[PDB]
Design an enzyme around this catalytic site. Structure first.
Site, PDB file in Angstrom:
ATOM      1  N   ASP A 125       0.802  -1.218   0.000  1.00 45.34           N
ATOM      2  CA  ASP A 125       0.000   0.000   0.000  1.00 45.34           C
ATOM      3  C   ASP A 125       0.843   1.280   0.000  1.00 45.34           C
ATOM      4  O   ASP A 125       1.188   1.804   1.058  1.00 45.34           O
ATOM      5  CB  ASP A 125      -0.944  -0.033   1.219  1.00 45.34           C
ATOM      6  CG  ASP A 125      -2.001   1.048   1.191  1.00 45.34           C
ATOM      7  OD1 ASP A 125      -1.974   1.895   0.274  1.00 45.34           O
ATOM      8  OD2 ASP A 125      -2.868   1.052   2.096  1.00 45.34           O
ATOM      9  N   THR A 126       1.144   1.813  -1.184  1.00 48.09           N
ATOM     10  CA  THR A 126       2.000   2.993  -1.258  1.00 48.09           C
ATOM     11  C   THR A 126       1.301   4.245  -0.709  1.00 48.09           C
ATOM     12  O   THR A 126       1.948   5.260  -0.410  1.00 48.09           O
ATOM     13  CB  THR A 126       2.478   3.245  -2.703  1.00 48.09           C
ATOM     14  OG1 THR A 126       1.347   3.431  -3.570  1.00 48.09           O
ATOM     15  CG2 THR A 126       3.313   2.067  -3.181  1.00 48.09           C
ATOM     16  N   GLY A 127      -0.023   4.183  -0.585  1.00 46.93           N
ATOM     17  CA  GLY A 127      -0.795   5.275  -0.017  1.00 46.93           C
ATOM     18  C   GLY A 127      -0.934   5.272   1.495  1.00 46.93           C
ATOM     19  O   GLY A 127      -1.716   6.061   2.029  1.00 46.93           O
TER      20      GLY A 127
HETATM   21  C1  LIG Z   1     -11.212  -1.149  -1.571  1.00 42.72           C
HETATM   22  O1  LIG Z   1     -11.081   0.122  -0.942  1.00 42.72           O
HETATM   23  C2  LIG Z   1     -10.049   1.044  -1.362  1.00 42.72           C
HETATM   24  O2  LIG Z   1      -9.320   0.760  -2.294  1.00 42.72           O
HETATM   25  N1  LIG Z   1     -10.000   2.150  -0.624  1.00 42.72           N
HETATM   26  C3  LIG Z   1      -9.045   3.220  -0.827  1.00 42.72           C
HETATM   27  C4  LIG Z   1      -8.304   3.474   0.450  1.00 42.72           C
HETATM   28  O3  LIG Z   1      -8.825   4.137   1.325  1.00 42.72           O
HETATM   29  N2  LIG Z   1      -7.099   2.898   0.533  1.00 42.72           N
HETATM   30  C5  LIG Z   1      -6.247   2.997   1.720  1.00 42.72           C
HETATM   31  C6  LIG Z   1      -6.021   1.565   2.203  1.00 42.72           C
HETATM   32  C7  LIG Z   1      -7.332   0.840   2.407  1.00 42.72           C
HETATM   33  C8  LIG Z   1      -7.732  -0.158   1.526  1.00 42.72           C
HETATM   34  C9  LIG Z   1      -8.954  -0.807   1.732  1.00 42.72           C
HETATM   35  C10 LIG Z   1      -9.762  -0.443   2.809  1.00 42.72           C
HETATM   36  C11 LIG Z   1      -9.343   0.540   3.690  1.00 42.72           C
HETATM   37  C12 LIG Z   1      -8.127   1.184   3.484  1.00 42.72           C
HETATM   38  C13 LIG Z   1      -4.911   3.688   1.402  1.00 42.72           C
HETATM   39  O4  LIG Z   1      -4.283   3.126   0.264  1.00 42.72           O
HETATM   40  C14 LIG Z   1      -5.058   5.197   1.181  1.00 42.72           C
HETATM   41  N3  LIG Z   1      -5.415   5.814   2.449  1.00 42.72           N
HETATM   42  C15 LIG Z   1      -6.016   7.127   2.265  1.00 42.72           C
HETATM   43  C16 LIG Z   1      -5.143   8.327   2.556  1.00 42.72           C
HETATM   44  C17 LIG Z   1      -4.070   8.649   1.968  1.00 42.72           C
HETATM   45  C18 LIG Z   1      -3.442   9.634   2.246  1.00 42.72           C
HETATM   46  C19 LIG Z   1      -3.777  10.434   3.170  1.00 42.72           C
HETATM   47  C20 LIG Z   1      -3.047  11.702   3.535  1.00 42.72           C
HETATM   48  C21 LIG Z   1      -3.158  12.264   4.809  1.00 42.72           C
HETATM   49  C22 LIG Z   1      -2.503  13.449   5.105  1.00 42.72           C
HETATM   50  C23 LIG Z   1      -1.765  14.075   4.111  1.00 42.72           C
HETATM   51  C24 LIG Z   1      -1.696  13.501   2.849  1.00 42.72           C
HETATM   52  N4  LIG Z   1      -2.333  12.349   2.583  1.00 42.72           N
HETATM   53  C25 LIG Z   1      -4.908  10.186   3.839  1.00 42.72           C
HETATM   54  C26 LIG Z   1      -5.601   9.113   3.526  1.00 42.72           C
HETATM   55  N5  LIG Z   1      -4.450   5.760   3.362  1.00 42.72           N
HETATM   56  C27 LIG Z   1      -4.741   5.706   4.651  1.00 42.72           C
HETATM   57  O5  LIG Z   1      -5.878   5.722   5.097  1.00 42.72           O
HETATM   58  C28 LIG Z   1      -3.544   5.676   5.560  1.00 42.72           C
HETATM   59  N6  LIG Z   1      -3.403   7.005   6.088  1.00 42.72           N
HETATM   60  C29 LIG Z   1      -2.300   7.738   6.006  1.00 42.72           C
HETATM   61  O6  LIG Z   1      -1.244   7.407   5.482  1.00 42.72           O
HETATM   62  O7  LIG Z   1      -2.460   9.031   6.626  1.00 42.72           O
HETATM   63  C30 LIG Z   1      -1.379   9.953   6.470  1.00 42.72           C
HETATM   64  C31 LIG Z   1      -3.602   4.622   6.675  1.00 42.72           C
HETATM   65  C32 LIG Z   1      -3.881   3.279   6.016  1.00 42.72           C
HETATM   66  C33 LIG Z   1      -2.220   4.600   7.328  1.00 42.72           C
HETATM   67  C34 LIG Z   1      -4.618   4.938   7.768  1.00 42.72           C
HETATM   68  C35 LIG Z   1      -9.783   4.425  -1.415  1.00 42.72           C
HETATM   69  C36 LIG Z   1     -11.000   4.875  -0.625  1.00 42.72           C
HETATM   70  C37 LIG Z   1      -8.796   5.589  -1.553  1.00 42.72           C
HETATM   71  C38 LIG Z   1     -10.277   4.012  -2.802  1.00 42.72           C
END
Ligand SMILES: COC(=O)N[C@H](C(=O)N[C@@H](Cc1ccccc1)[C@@H](O)CN(Cc1ccc(-c2ccccn2)cc1)NC(=O)[C@@H](NC(=O)OC)C(C)(C)C)C(C)(C)C
Lengths: 99, 99
Positions: free
Chosen positions: B25-27
């Site tokens: 998960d690069t995000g």
């Molecule tokens: C099948 O569902 C998905 O693919 N869900 C995706 C999703 O939320 N992916 C998450 C991982 C995930 C997959 C499946 C279910 C639940 C979660 C991440 O790839 C992206 N996400 C969403 C995201 C990405 C970036 C940021 C962010 C926050 C502050 C500044 C810049 N970016 C916030 C939320 N990242 C985070 O929530 C992370 N948050 C994070 O790194 O916070 C800094 C966590 C994980 C560590 C909590 C989307 C809604 C974006 C389509």
């Protein structure tokens, strides 16, 4: 290019003449953009993130330029703390994970 | 390996002798796994993404093998919708995005 992961993999995107930044996210099925007005029809979609489901708008066949590569596909618009480029478009630009 | 993105980049991980599936998960800044018991001191932590805040437990210096590549780092544990390998460990195994 090769993009390392020491910091968030944020790149410049261009959509409808709007210059923005977005996170290249292999953990995202879909592409999710901060609020913007996009052309054409949309319908609601429920997607799930870490904190649960949220409602977004789904627009289809929206062109987006990602790091100078052309993509066109479904773009979701809604409450997100960042623009997120998901796998639907990452595949279109030939993105892989390598280790 | 090289991992393409036409399907979710799910891989097998080994942690505490237990095998689990997790998303590369690069995000994700952090690594977040479903409820499980891990050894030693943990600290409650709040993390945030789409859908809002989640309460997790933070364990540090945890060995985890990801596709046979060893890492030792921080693993968060809580009611995540998906087991997630974030950048903290992707960097340890030398992961990059390429296109
Ligand atoms: C099948 O569902 C998905 O693919 N869900 C995706 C999703 O939320 N992916 C998450 C991982 C995930 C997959 C499946 C279910 C639940 C979660 C991440 O790839 C992206 N996400 C969403 C995201 C990405 C970036 C940021 C962010 C926050 C502050 C500044 C810049 N970016 C916030 C939320 N990242 C985070 O929530 C992370 N948050 C994070 O790194 O916070 C800094 C966590 C994980 C560590 C909590 C989307 C809604 C974006 C389509």
């Amino acid at each position: 290019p090769q993009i390392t992961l020491w910091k968030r993999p944020i790149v410049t995107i261009r959509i409808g003449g709007q210059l923005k930044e977005a996170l290249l996210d292999t953990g995202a099925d879909d592409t999710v953009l901060e609020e913007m007005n996009l052309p054409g029809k949309w319908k609601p979609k429920m997607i799930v993130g870490i904190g649960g489901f949220v409602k977004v708008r789904q627009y289809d066949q929206i062109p987006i330029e990602i790091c100078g590569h052309k993509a066109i596909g479904t773009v979701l618009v809604g409450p997100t703390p960042a623009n997120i480029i998901g796998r639907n478009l990452l595949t279109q630009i030939g993105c892989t994970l390598n280790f």
